[PDB]
Amino acid sequence: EARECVNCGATATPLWRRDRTGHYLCNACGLYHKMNGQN
């Protein structure tokens, strides 16, 4: 597929949320690194 998620694996996401290290987040679980402020 296009890429994988750290919590799910929604390859149908409009845009992958990538950080400095490379934490590929779909778009939904990516909020965990913002709202919750986790890793």
């Binding site: 296009a2 890429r3 390859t11 409009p14 845009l15 992958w16 990538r18």
Partner: protein, 96 residues
């Protein structure tokens, strides 16, 4: 009143003039469109910070890149280097 455009000019896939609504990654030079930037094989949408290949007509991902090449031309062997791959840069922002 003022018109601020800082793109190449014409598309490489369609005949539409590139305006402040391309929303595409910084390719080698010839830029495409937010719709003209799709894989020539799986037709999937590209990612950010990942590797990709540029062809003559369209572009190719990193998923079927090992297939598209062999079915067109270019094989460095089963495990051998056949060439080089590029990484998709940051999406062009109209302002910022």
């Amino acid at each position: 009143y003022l018109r601020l455009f800082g793109q190449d000019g014409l598309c490489a896939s369609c005949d539409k003039r590139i305006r402040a609504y391309e929303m595409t990654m910084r390719v080698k030079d010839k830029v495409y469109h937010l719709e003209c930037f799709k894989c020539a094989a799986c037709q999937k949408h590209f990612s950010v910070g990942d590797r990709y290949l540029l062809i003559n007509s369209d572009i190719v991902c990193e998923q079927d890149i090992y297939e598209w090449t062999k079915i067109n031309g270019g094989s460095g062997g089963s495990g051998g280097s056949g060439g080089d791959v590029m990484v998709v840069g940051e999406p062009t922002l109209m302002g910022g």
